[PDB]
DNA sequence: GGAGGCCAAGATCTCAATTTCGTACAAGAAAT
DNA sequence: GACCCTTCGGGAGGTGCATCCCGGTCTCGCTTGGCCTCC
């Protein structure tokens, strides 16, 4: 068992963005911040870890074998336990505290669960956050605005029947009237939210009620729009993302990694390199990354770690250089004693 | 320098002829041709200073060099107590192997070494840790003595001099001594500091706008002074805004124009003491009178001279630590440079306070109008280091001080 | 043997302070610090060297070192926190790599962490989390500053194990009146009952370490005492 | 017998988090604060002390090694004596309580127990809290959400048979039903919290007991779910951690230390640098630190520190500096006198 | 066939609730 | 083979629209006998 540290950089091919419920607020979309509003945003280790765990789950599904017409020989409980560590059945063998070698048999038979952990079983893999290199390297990408297709180019209107043209007329008049009414209501709402700043606690209750009621008024005003519930033409709030070519330092660790588990992890990185996507806004191709990792193992009691090799994920291929990385991959590919079932 | 930064082949320009009818101290014209000696005694001879300024004698050999300049270097070398500028001691060790040879005949004594370091990072930069170089230089001599009035961040030697222990690269093992010597009875000092409530100095610092409320408060406290005072602002821009906002209700207001020379305002101020608003300045200077006496009972440090944020330094140091291999985030380097700038801020404000007292009989009223100066009672303030500008021997007066705009001055019943 | 001045030392509280019934006295902190500086578990030598940096009241048998008094600011005050020591039986601690558990049928007998002598001890201890800790003492300022800044001493209980009461930014300021033993008849430290100082009766030794020697009847101040930081810096 | 004070900085390679029962409330996971929420948090010295004690125990077991049978020589009693410090078999040297300097024989024979004491025997290693130097060096990290794998990627639905696509449809319908029910139950619960705010005291106790009945009703609705038990589309609460690259100041000290005990401590530090992990959330690689410790000692007979060397733990290696530190490590390694047993 | 070794029950409950560091000047050169 | 002499003034916008919603966990800090294996 070796402790492998993948220390390396994620270069950004297309902006790297993520919406975490914690970070974002009503002020707009913000990246998860390194402890403060005026801090360097980091790409969370949670998103990277989930992407790699799903890549490893697909690696396992491929490695066992797609039988039938592509259906994998795994139930839904197994897929959830392998990819998210949640047992829907509850039949997962909960290791009562104090159990010696907790899950050692499960770790030996399920290298994936050993790597990415479960409830009551520590995951050997720790996927750290990707911290950017240098000031800036983040920006408000996306954005823009929905425009009515038929108000932009008139040729598409030759493809619309008369009744559909009158439908568009009614839809736009409805959008305008709803916009004016909702905007007046929102002006009242933001004046009320300005009255928050005069924060007398006794008033705050009456203001939260008097603003959530005005937001229900907004919802009801939208609900009576026969043609379109939502205004079709509207500016898109931009999302904060790491710019293209941004260098994000990444640290990943596998504690006490067997050659089988480390080979599974390297195969997960290999399959991730096919679709090296991190985060969301994949409609704008956000998340495409090329990443290079230096694998260094550290024998405990030795003052220095030794370098096993380098994993380079690039659009031109995966360069896994190093005798020990290939040894790990071959050992994982050649071990037939993994039970991923219940 | 080179004589008074001059040459000898081309002195004939400033000999007698019609081109300039200076006349007056005609003797100088003929003696100066063979006046090998440096600038200072020129003044001791005469104050006239004819032929207009002649700061560098209407230009001389800025980098073109002179002939037989060696003789001046020899006169320095064989002379026992070599007095130079910090410029010569760094050119010697960066420019070329060694400008001035030495082997068991020379002993660096870097006085005001605090600014000898603070300027070191500007030459090219300390992005590659150029400091290390000069550190070996101090080792290479028999002994280098780095002293300063502000060679400390705290009153403790080994906690406060660690910026010297970490910038030049000299370490305890090779450090001969690390000590602070402060007199106990040296002068007197009344401290008045602006509290937390005091109006914020910068409404928006980035684009350098000074909040009008702070300007009004500062002019108000300036006009309440009943005697000559020395106002040490931080920027000449602050000097200009404070001069603009002042109505000159007080005795003559003397202003340091951006890129002016302080000593002209000094001698403007000796003839008629008053209120002197001089940003920058200092560098170990004092508007002392003719025989020598404290001619400004008040010293107003409007704001602590906080150094701007320097993205160039942050990105350069991050580059060097990324090529060297250290795995530190850019934010960590930003914090390190911020702390180093805070240390240089404390040193600069220690120089500012040193401009108040220069004799054992001096009695100075230090007025800090900055709302970010730590109150005595606010020990958890971010800038808690900033009371180290005050000497230890006046720290009682720091603890017993007048606060103009204090905060939470009520009595809490949960005592 | 050295001249001694009345000093007040105020330190920024970093950790909650577990008070062991009697308020931690500054002489006990200094006795731990001198027990480290000159490595010595023998009380006599450490006491002798403490007398060289702290004034010792012969007529009372106590050091001129007041008990802990929390300095509370208008922003942060004395708070009730729990210093919580929990045993963490990690999967690596519960592994055959470290020990040979008793075996039956190849199965390793799991450790009963719920109860028993091998349980997960959850020791909660009242701790007081105030922004500042202040002590009053009569002694050499440089020595006490050096000890408090560059020794592993905290305030309260189990700082050598639980790191409770870690402090930094030790500021020593001179006092005008000795408020280390007594203040208007109110005891500021563990004092003997015969001293005539009124306070809270208790059983303790007078001189540190406060867990050895015969525990005699003493009068000690309120274990938790609070003062405004402004009033403490007034001097 | 020298008091080695290690003073130094821990730089946080990946965020440093810890769960403490008092610090964590229903409002969310927060670091120990030593005051209110506005105070500066600290990483407890207890967690670091436990980590270094575990590292020292690993060093001791490796130095002892295994028997000829391939089993560790330590039993449960010895293992708990060396790890947790509590006597389980009731067989320990109960030294007189008035003898400060007791246990010299056990201290010499067991340097681990000497450094980290057992019950009834004071230890000699005092670990401090990692105190941050800055003001905004902590933040809400991790969190995110447990996205349903099949609602994110549709490629993962080509690997499920229809009998499991219907179990997926049933588990999502169960999740939505249960979340609606729990939503209305929590709404009634919060209205009850409001009536506790009233505390008219007519029937406040009964209002509390019906709140308890409501939590039981939450657990009943959450047992009616017969496919899953927990909602899988769970927003993960963020945990509070020290930002990446946070400079935390650390004081450790071994008091009255033999060269053997100090060498054992330095070997524990060296082994800890193999996996320099403090605290939890190791799934996100949290706890990876690099730390430089200036090892000073007290001059014999005066109150002055003399620097003996530096212990620079970095991912690139452990840089022990100073000849006396190497002498201590060699003294601990070479001494064949330790009997880590009864 | 008496020693482990795992597992279920014991009735009660205290209480606490968050919105963004630092903004410059010099003086002085035998040069990189 | 020496200078000449360096231009004005305009005029600087208008609108539209700012989404829908999920879904917030297990624990456990103790002791005892009952039952089940089993040296």
Author numbering:
A (entry chain B), D (entry chain A): 1 to 342
B (entry chain M): 105 to 227, 333 to 624
C (entry chain F): 1 to 235
Publication text:
Type IV-A CRISPR-Cas systems diverge from this general mechanism, using a nuclease-independent interference pathway to suppress gene expression for gene regulation and plasmid competition. Here, we present several cryo-EM structures of two evolutionary distant type IV-A1 and type IV-A3 complexes (from Pseudomonas oleovorans and Klebsiella pneumoniae, respectively) bound to cognate DNA targets with and without DinG. The structures reveal multisubunit DNA-surveillance complexes that intimately recognize their DNA-targets to form an R-loop structure. Our results support a model in which DNA-binding is achieved analogously to type I Cascade, while recruitment of DinG differs mechanistically, even in closely related subtypes.
Cryo-EM grid optimization and exhaustive data collection yielded a sufficient amount of particles to reconstruct three structures of the DinG-bound type IV-A3 effector complex, with DinG resolved at ~3 Å to ~7 Å in three distinct states (states I–III). However, density was lacking for the arch domain in state II and only present at low resolution in state III. Similar to the type IV-A1 structure, type IV-A3 DinG is recruited to the NTS at the belly side of the complex. We next compared the three type IV-A3 DinG states, based on a structural alignment of the complexes. This revealed that the Cas8 and Cas5 contacting C-terminus, and Cas7 palm binding segments of α-helices 21 and 22 of DinG, do not rearrange between the states. Thus, the C-terminus and α-helices 21 and 22 appear to anchor DinG to the complex. Between states I and II, the HD domains maintain their relative and overall conformations, while the vFeS moves towards the center of DinG. The arch domain becomes stabilized in state I, as corroborated by the absence and presence of cryo-EM density in states II and I, respectively. Examination of the cryo-EM map also revealed low local resolutions (4–7 Å) for the vFeS domain and NTS exiting the HD2 in all states. This limits the accuracy of structural interpretations and suggests an inherent flexibility within these regions.
